[PDB]
Amino acid sequence: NIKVMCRFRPLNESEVNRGDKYIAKFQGEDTVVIASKPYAFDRVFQSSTSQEQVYNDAAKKIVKDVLEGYNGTIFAYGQTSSGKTHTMEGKLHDPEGMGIIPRIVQDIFNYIYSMDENLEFHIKVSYFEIYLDKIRDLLDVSKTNLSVHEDKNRVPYVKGATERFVSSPDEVMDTIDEGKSNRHVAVEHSSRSHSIFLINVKQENTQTEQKLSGKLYLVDLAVSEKVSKTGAEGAVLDEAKNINKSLSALGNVISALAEGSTYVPYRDSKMTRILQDSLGGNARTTIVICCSPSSYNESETKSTLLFGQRAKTIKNTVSVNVE
Protein backbone atom coordinates (compact mmCIF):
# COMPACT_ATOMS: atom_id res chain seq x y z
CA ASN A 1 0.00 0.00 0.00
CA ILE A 2 3.08 2.22 0.38
CA LYS A 3 5.18 2.60 -2.76
CA VAL A 4 8.28 4.56 -3.78
CA MET A 5 8.57 5.20 -7.52
CA CYS A 6 11.36 6.83 -9.52
CA ARG A 7 10.78 8.79 -12.73
CA PHE A 8 13.57 9.75 -15.14
CA ARG A 9 13.02 12.54 -17.65
CA PRO A 10 14.46 12.91 -21.16
CA LEU A 11 17.47 15.12 -21.74
CA ASN A 12 16.99 18.73 -22.84
CA GLU A 13 18.22 20.62 -25.89
CA SER A 14 20.99 22.34 -23.93
CA GLU A 15 22.02 19.08 -22.26
CA VAL A 16 22.61 17.30 -25.57
CA ASN A 17 24.16 20.34 -27.26
CA ARG A 18 26.75 20.78 -24.49
CA GLY A 19 27.66 17.08 -24.49
CA ASP A 20 26.15 15.90 -21.21
CA LYS A 21 26.34 12.18 -20.52
CA TYR A 22 23.86 9.43 -19.74
CA ILE A 23 24.66 7.92 -16.33
CA ALA A 24 21.57 5.77 -15.70
CA LYS A 25 21.42 2.09 -16.70
CA PHE A 26 18.00 0.51 -16.23
CA GLN A 27 17.54 -3.16 -15.32
CA GLY A 28 14.21 -4.78 -14.64
CA GLU A 29 11.24 -2.49 -14.26
CA ASP A 30 12.46 -1.48 -10.80
CA THR A 31 16.26 -1.08 -10.71
CA VAL A 32 18.43 1.82 -11.89
CA VAL A 33 22.23 1.70 -11.67
CA ILE A 34 24.29 4.90 -11.44
CA ALA A 35 28.09 4.80 -11.62
CA SER A 36 28.14 1.30 -10.15
CA LYS A 37 25.55 1.41 -7.35
CA PRO A 38 22.10 -0.06 -8.03
CA TYR A 39 18.90 1.33 -6.55
CA ALA A 40 15.72 -0.76 -6.42
CA PHE A 41 12.29 0.81 -5.91
CA ASP A 42 8.69 -0.31 -6.34
CA ARG A 43 8.82 1.05 -9.90
CA VAL A 44 11.35 2.84 -12.11
CA PHE A 45 9.72 4.74 -14.98
CA GLN A 46 12.17 5.29 -17.80
CA SER A 47 12.15 8.37 -20.02
CA SER A 48 10.22 6.47 -22.70
CA THR A 49 7.33 5.84 -20.27
CA SER A 50 4.43 8.17 -21.03
CA GLN A 51 2.73 10.49 -18.55
CA GLU A 52 -0.44 8.40 -18.65
CA GLN A 53 1.43 5.26 -17.57
CA VAL A 54 3.11 7.13 -14.71
CA TYR A 55 -0.32 8.34 -13.59
CA ASN A 56 -1.97 4.92 -13.92
CA ASP A 57 0.75 3.26 -11.86
CA ALA A 58 1.30 5.99 -9.24
CA ALA A 59 -1.98 7.88 -8.67
CA LYS A 60 -4.96 6.22 -10.41
CA LYS A 61 -5.97 3.87 -7.60
CA ILE A 62 -5.35 6.62 -5.03
CA VAL A 63 -7.89 8.76 -6.89
CA LYS A 64 -10.33 5.84 -7.02
CA ASP A 65 -9.91 5.26 -3.27
CA VAL A 66 -10.48 8.94 -2.47
CA LEU A 67 -13.63 8.76 -4.62
CA GLU A 68 -14.77 5.84 -2.42
CA GLY A 69 -14.32 7.78 0.83
CA TYR A 70 -10.76 6.69 1.67
CA ASN A 71 -7.59 8.77 2.03
CA GLY A 72 -4.43 8.93 -0.04
CA THR A 73 -1.18 10.87 -0.17
CA ILE A 74 1.28 11.53 -3.00
CA PHE A 75 4.74 13.03 -2.43
CA ALA A 76 7.14 14.55 -4.95
CA TYR A 77 10.89 14.81 -4.31
CA GLY A 78 13.48 16.31 -6.64
CA GLN A 79 14.70 19.64 -7.95
CA THR A 80 12.70 21.47 -10.60
CA SER A 81 15.48 20.68 -13.11
CA SER A 82 15.10 16.93 -12.48
CA GLY A 83 11.65 16.79 -14.09
CA LYS A 84 9.43 17.13 -11.02
CA THR A 85 7.44 19.94 -12.65
CA HIS A 86 7.07 17.87 -15.83
CA THR A 87 5.98 14.79 -13.87
CA MET A 88 3.49 16.43 -11.49
CA GLU A 89 2.22 19.24 -13.75
CA GLY A 90 3.59 18.99 -17.30
CA LYS A 91 2.09 20.79 -20.27
CA LEU A 92 -1.50 21.37 -19.16
CA HIS A 93 -3.14 21.92 -22.57
CA ASP A 94 -1.41 18.79 -23.93
CA PRO A 95 -3.47 15.62 -23.24
CA GLU A 96 -0.28 13.56 -23.62
CA GLY A 97 2.04 15.94 -21.74
CA MET A 98 -0.30 16.39 -18.79
CA GLY A 99 1.14 15.80 -15.34
CA ILE A 100 -0.24 13.83 -12.43
CA ILE A 101 -2.31 16.64 -10.88
CA PRO A 102 -4.29 17.51 -14.06
CA ARG A 103 -5.12 13.82 -14.52
CA ILE A 104 -6.16 13.53 -10.86
CA VAL A 105 -8.49 16.51 -11.17
CA GLN A 106 -9.86 15.32 -14.51
CA ASP A 107 -10.63 11.87 -13.11
CA ILE A 108 -12.27 13.28 -9.98
CA PHE A 109 -14.56 15.65 -11.88
CA ASN A 110 -15.41 13.12 -14.59
CA TYR A 111 -16.40 10.58 -11.95
CA ILE A 112 -18.50 13.16 -10.11
CA TYR A 113 -20.29 14.17 -13.32
CA SER A 114 -20.94 10.48 -14.03
CA MET A 115 -23.04 10.04 -10.88
CA ASP A 116 -26.70 10.89 -10.45
CA GLU A 117 -28.28 13.52 -8.19
CA ASN A 118 -28.81 10.91 -5.45
CA LEU A 119 -25.20 11.71 -4.52
CA GLU A 120 -24.50 15.32 -3.51
CA PHE A 121 -20.81 16.04 -4.15
CA HIS A 122 -18.74 18.89 -2.72
CA ILE A 123 -15.03 19.30 -3.48
CA LYS A 124 -13.06 21.43 -1.01
CA VAL A 125 -9.40 22.37 -1.36
CA SER A 126 -6.74 23.72 0.99
CA TYR A 127 -3.17 24.84 0.41
CA PHE A 128 -0.39 25.65 2.87
CA GLU A 129 3.38 25.39 3.10
CA ILE A 130 5.68 24.45 5.97
CA TYR A 131 8.62 26.86 5.86
CA LEU A 132 11.16 26.70 8.70
CA ASP A 133 8.64 24.57 10.62
CA LYS A 134 6.01 27.32 10.30
CA ILE A 135 2.65 26.50 8.70
CA ARG A 136 1.74 29.36 6.34
CA ASP A 137 -1.65 29.37 4.60
CA LEU A 138 -1.14 29.82 0.85
CA LEU A 139 -4.83 30.67 0.26
CA ASP A 140 -4.69 33.49 2.84
CA VAL A 141 -1.42 35.40 3.33
CA SER A 142 -2.69 36.92 6.59
CA LYS A 143 -2.66 33.45 8.21
CA THR A 144 0.82 32.45 9.35
CA ASN A 145 2.00 30.28 12.26
CA LEU A 146 -1.05 28.03 12.09
CA SER A 147 -1.40 25.43 14.82
CA VAL A 148 -2.13 21.70 14.85
CA HIS A 149 -4.96 20.45 17.08
CA GLU A 150 -6.73 17.13 17.73
CA ASP A 151 -10.50 16.91 17.29
CA LYS A 152 -12.57 14.49 19.42
CA ASN A 153 -10.47 11.51 18.43
CA ARG A 154 -6.71 12.11 18.44
CA VAL A 155 -6.78 13.03 14.74
CA PRO A 156 -4.50 16.02 14.03
CA TYR A 157 -5.80 18.87 11.88
CA VAL A 158 -4.56 22.35 10.98
CA LYS A 159 -6.85 24.80 12.77
CA GLY A 160 -8.10 27.75 10.75
CA ALA A 161 -6.79 26.54 7.40
CA THR A 162 -8.60 28.05 4.42
CA GLU A 163 -11.03 25.64 2.73
CA ARG A 164 -12.45 26.64 -0.66
CA PHE A 165 -15.26 24.98 -2.59
CA VAL A 166 -14.21 24.17 -6.16
CA SER A 167 -16.57 23.09 -8.93
CA SER A 168 -14.41 22.71 -12.07
CA PRO A 169 -10.90 21.47 -12.93
CA ASP A 170 -9.91 24.96 -14.08
CA GLU A 171 -10.91 26.32 -10.68
CA VAL A 172 -8.62 23.77 -9.02
CA MET A 173 -5.72 24.76 -11.29
CA ASP A 174 -6.33 28.45 -10.60
CA THR A 175 -6.25 27.67 -6.88
CA ILE A 176 -2.97 25.79 -7.29
CA ASP A 177 -1.35 28.66 -9.19
CA GLU A 178 -2.59 31.21 -6.66
CA GLY A 179 -1.18 29.13 -3.82
CA LYS A 180 2.17 28.73 -5.57
CA SER A 181 2.38 32.50 -6.11
CA ASN A 182 2.12 33.06 -2.33
CA ARG A 183 5.14 31.03 -1.17
CA HIS A 184 8.15 32.43 0.69
CA VAL A 185 10.61 32.77 -2.25
CA ALA A 186 13.27 34.50 -0.06
CA VAL A 187 16.80 34.50 -1.51
CA GLU A 188 15.60 31.69 -6.89
CA HIS A 189 14.15 28.48 -8.36
CA SER A 190 14.46 25.90 -5.57
CA SER A 191 12.35 23.98 -3.04
CA ARG A 192 12.97 25.25 0.52
CA SER A 193 9.57 24.39 2.04
CA HIS A 194 7.00 21.59 2.00
CA SER A 195 3.91 22.52 -0.06
CA ILE A 196 0.85 20.50 0.95
CA PHE A 197 -2.24 20.71 -1.27
CA LEU A 198 -5.52 19.05 -0.28
CA ILE A 199 -8.40 17.75 -2.39
CA ASN A 200 -11.28 16.88 -0.06
CA VAL A 201 -13.90 14.94 -2.03
CA LYS A 202 -17.01 14.85 0.18
CA GLN A 203 -20.25 13.14 -0.83
CA GLU A 204 -23.67 12.37 0.62
CA ASN A 205 -26.30 9.96 -0.61
CA THR A 206 -29.25 12.20 0.16
CA GLN A 207 -31.70 9.48 1.26
CA THR A 208 -29.39 7.39 3.44
CA GLU A 209 -27.70 10.63 4.60
CA GLN A 210 -24.49 8.57 4.88
CA LYS A 211 -21.57 10.91 4.23
CA LEU A 212 -18.08 10.03 2.97
CA SER A 213 -15.06 12.34 3.16
CA GLY A 214 -11.93 11.35 1.26
CA LYS A 215 -8.75 13.40 1.59
CA LEU A 216 -6.06 13.41 -1.11
CA TYR A 217 -2.85 15.21 -0.15
CA LEU A 218 -0.44 16.31 -2.89
CA VAL A 219 2.86 17.15 -1.18
CA ASP A 220 5.79 19.01 -2.74
CA LEU A 221 8.72 18.10 -0.50
CA ALA A 222 11.69 20.35 0.15
CA VAL A 223 14.89 19.06 -1.44
CA SER A 224 18.19 18.64 0.40
CA GLU A 225 20.76 20.52 -1.69
CA LYS A 226 24.53 20.30 -1.75
CA VAL A 227 26.63 22.32 0.68
CA SER A 228 26.63 25.87 -0.66
CA LYS A 229 29.91 27.77 -0.93
CA THR A 230 28.49 30.64 1.15
CA GLY A 231 27.59 29.55 4.68
CA ALA A 232 26.48 31.66 7.65
CA GLU A 233 25.28 34.63 5.59
CA GLY A 234 21.48 34.31 5.41
CA ALA A 235 18.73 31.79 6.10
CA VAL A 236 20.10 28.93 3.98
CA LEU A 237 21.77 27.33 7.01
CA ASP A 238 18.47 27.29 8.92
CA GLU A 239 16.54 25.95 5.92
CA ALA A 240 19.15 23.19 5.65
CA LYS A 241 18.68 22.05 9.24
CA ASN A 242 14.88 22.14 9.05
CA ILE A 243 14.76 20.34 5.69
CA ASN A 244 17.08 17.63 7.02
CA LYS A 245 15.08 16.95 10.18
CA SER A 246 11.64 17.09 8.55
CA LEU A 247 12.64 14.80 5.68
CA SER A 248 14.07 12.36 8.24
CA ALA A 249 10.91 12.32 10.36
CA LEU A 250 8.95 11.73 7.15
CA GLY A 251 11.33 8.91 6.27
CA ASN A 252 10.91 7.29 9.68
CA VAL A 253 7.11 7.46 9.38
CA ILE A 254 6.95 6.03 5.85
CA SER A 255 9.44 3.30 6.82
CA ALA A 256 7.59 2.44 10.03
CA LEU A 257 4.26 2.26 8.19
CA ALA A 258 5.79 0.19 5.37
CA GLU A 259 7.09 -2.34 7.92
CA GLY A 260 3.68 -2.45 9.63
CA SER A 261 5.04 -0.95 12.84
CA THR A 262 2.70 -0.03 15.69
CA TYR A 263 5.16 2.66 16.83
CA VAL A 264 4.81 5.17 13.98
CA PRO A 265 6.67 8.38 15.00
CA TYR A 266 4.02 10.84 13.84
CA ARG A 267 4.69 13.50 16.51
CA ASP A 268 8.32 14.11 15.40
CA SER A 269 7.41 16.78 12.81
CA LYS A 270 4.53 19.01 11.75
CA MET A 271 3.98 17.39 8.36
CA THR A 272 3.65 13.83 9.67
CA ARG A 273 0.97 14.99 12.12
CA ILE A 274 -1.00 16.89 9.46
CA LEU A 275 -0.78 13.77 7.28
CA GLN A 276 -1.27 11.30 10.14
CA ASP A 277 -4.91 10.81 9.15
CA SER A 278 -4.11 10.11 5.48
CA LEU A 279 -0.99 7.96 6.04
CA GLY A 280 -2.33 5.42 8.54
CA GLY A 281 -5.21 2.99 8.17
CA ASN A 282 -3.45 1.24 5.26
CA ALA A 283 -4.18 4.27 3.07
CA ARG A 284 -2.21 4.22 -0.17
CA THR A 285 0.84 6.50 -0.25
CA THR A 286 3.13 7.00 -3.24
CA ILE A 287 6.44 8.88 -3.18
CA VAL A 288 7.50 9.93 -6.67
CA ILE A 289 11.18 10.87 -6.83
CA CYS A 290 12.17 12.59 -10.08
CA CYS A 291 15.68 12.33 -11.50
CA SER A 292 17.76 13.60 -14.43
CA PRO A 293 19.83 11.12 -16.46
CA SER A 294 22.39 13.81 -17.35
CA SER A 295 25.87 13.65 -15.83
CA TYR A 296 25.69 17.38 -15.03
CA ASN A 297 23.17 16.43 -12.31
CA GLU A 298 24.83 13.20 -11.15
CA SER A 299 25.25 14.63 -7.64
CA GLU A 300 21.56 15.55 -7.35
CA THR A 301 20.38 12.15 -8.60
CA LYS A 302 22.52 10.42 -5.97
CA SER A 303 20.78 12.48 -3.27
CA THR A 304 17.31 11.87 -4.71
CA LEU A 305 17.77 8.10 -5.01
CA LEU A 306 19.10 7.86 -1.45
CA PHE A 307 16.02 9.66 -0.12
CA GLY A 308 13.81 7.20 -1.97
CA GLN A 309 15.78 4.39 -0.33
CA ARG A 310 15.49 5.87 3.17
CA ALA A 311 11.70 5.83 2.77
CA LYS A 312 11.74 2.03 3.22
CA THR A 313 15.36 1.26 4.36
CA ILE A 314 17.71 -1.62 3.43
CA LYS A 315 19.64 -4.40 5.22
CA ASN A 316 22.99 -5.82 4.12
CA THR A 317 26.80 -5.81 4.74
CA VAL A 318 29.40 -8.54 5.64
CA SER A 319 33.21 -8.44 6.37
CA VAL A 320 35.69 -11.10 7.68
CA ASN A 321 38.15 -10.38 10.50
CA VAL A 322 41.02 -12.38 11.97
CA GLU A 323 41.19 -13.25 15.67
Swiss-Prot record:
Annotated signal sequence range: none
Residue ranges of every copy of the Kinesin motor domain listed in the record: 1-314
Cross-linked residues, Glycyl lysine isopeptide (Lys-Gly) (interchain with G-Cter in SUMO2): K202
Binding annotation for ATP: G78, Q79, T80, S81, S82, G83, K84, T85
Subcellular location per the Swiss-Prot or TrEMBL entry: Cytoplasm, Cytoskeleton; Cytolytic granule membrane; Lysosome membrane
Function: Microtubule-dependent motor required for normal distribution of mitochondria and lysosomes. Can induce formation of neurite-like membrane protrusions in non-neuronal cells in a ZFYVE27-dependent manner. Regulates centrosome and nuclear positioning during mitotic entry. During the G2 phase of the cell cycle in a BICD2-dependent manner, antagonizes dynein function and drives the separation of nuclei and centrosomes. Required for anterograde axonal transportation of MAPK8IP3/JIP3 which is essential for MAPK8IP3/JIP3 function in axon elongation.
Free-text domain note: Composed of three structural domains: a large globular N-terminal domain which is responsible for the motor activity of kinesin (it hydrolyzes ATP and binds microtubule), a central alpha-helical coiled coil domain that mediates the heavy chain dimerization; and a small globular C-terminal domain which interacts with other proteins (such as the kinesin light chains), vesicles and membranous organelles.
Assembly behavior: Oligomer composed of two heavy chains and two light chains. Interacts with GRIP1 and PPP1R42. Interacts with SYBU. Interacts with JAKMIP1. Interacts with PLEKHM2. Interacts with ECPAS. Interacts with ZFYVE27. Found in a complex with OGT, RHOT1, RHOT2 and TRAK1. Interacts with APP (via cytoplasmic domain).
Family to which the UniProt record says this protein belongs: Belongs to the TRAFAC class myosin-kinesin ATPase superfamily. Kinesin family. Kinesin subfamily.
Name of this chain's protein: Kinesin-1 heavy chain
Organism (species): Homo sapiens (Human)
